[PDB]
Write a protein that binds this ligand. Structure first.
Ligand SMILES: Nc1ncnc2c1ncn2[C@@H]1O[C@H](COP(=O)(O)O)[C@@H](O)[C@H]1O
Ligand SMILES: [Mg+2]
Ligand SMILES: [Mg+2]
Ligand SMILES: [Mg+2]
Ligand SMILES: [Zn+2]
Length: 247
């Protein structure tokens, strides 16, 4: 029968969240997992407005929410019938409400970096998937009393491959993922780096940002230690050279 959700989309260019609703039907058991999360096949039963579900203390704070939601990615990318992916944290105690929003914002920040990288006209352009926060409002808060939240994103079709980790592993020999990571480090004045570059070909998802202070950007932000680990194993390649990155 499916279930209702409040759907949150972040738009970096206005620095506001957009609040919508959707109906979805998720499989009972996950098809894959990572260190922190499990992934579930889901189907959209339609996207709508949040008009029927008022009040949305409060996080995000009201000043961070657009009162207008007419323009959004969800209504096309998650339209009725769309197969997509829902992710839950594994059995959690470290997962506050704010964390879910932090994760989704992080992926949106990485989309901005992908666009910036693409403006350099690299041999292979890249793209990060949209991600959204969903509040599964039909579910009981079967824990300490906290509502059930998750993130959702489009389904990747094809061979899912991880190219680097968030702690120095270089897992494939492809240039583009490693050059992108290096690009983010140099162009951010070493104030962040995007790693955990993974997905199907150059369509990526669940990246991870490190910043020197390790603040924000989720549980996987390993700070200077994570940045240095990337450096220890990074070998510049043909794409690094084309982008004139510091050797
Ligand atoms: N958008 C996606 N489409 C298909 N498979 C995915 C997607 N995101 C993650 N996966 C798979 O689910 C696992 C865990 O996802 P994550 O928690 O994002 O690392 C990954 O290692 C992939 O095998
Ligand atoms: Mg993974
Ligand atoms: Mg991550
Ligand atoms: Mg952090
Ligand atoms: Zn390099």
């Amino acid at each position: 029968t499916g279930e209702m959700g409040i759907l949150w989309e972040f738009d970096p260019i206005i620095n506001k969240w957009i609040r919508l609703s959707m109906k979805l039907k998720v499989e009972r058991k996950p098809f894959a997992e990572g260190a922190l999360r499990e992934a579930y096949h889901t189907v959209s039963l339609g996207v709508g407005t949040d008009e029927n579900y008022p009040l949305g203390k409060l996080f995000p704070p009201i000043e961070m929410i657009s009162p207008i939601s007419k323009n959004n990615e969800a209504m096309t990318q998650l339209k009725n019938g769309t197969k997509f992916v829902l992710k839950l944290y594994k059995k959690e105690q470290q997962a506050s409400r704010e964390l879910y929003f932090e994760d989704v914002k992080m992926q949106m920040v990485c989309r901005d970096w992908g666009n910036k990288f693409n403006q350099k006209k690299p041999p292979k352009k890249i793209e990060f998937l949209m991600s959204w926060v969903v509040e599964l409002i039909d579910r009981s808060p079967s824990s300490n009393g906290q509502p059930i939240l998750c993130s959702i994103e489009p389904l990747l079709v094809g061979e899912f491959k991880k190219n680097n980790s968030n702690y120095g592993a270089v897992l494939t020999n492809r240039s583009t993922p490693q050059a992108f990571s290096h690009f983010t480090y140099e162009l951010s004045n070493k104030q962040m780096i995007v790693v955990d570059i993974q997905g199907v070909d150059d369509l990526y998802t669940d990246p991870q940002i490190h910043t020197p202070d390790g603040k924000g950007f989720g549980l996987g932000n390993l700070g200077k230690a994570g940045i240095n680990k990337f450096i220890t194993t990074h070998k510049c390649n043909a794409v690094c050279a084309l982008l004139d990155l510091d050797v």
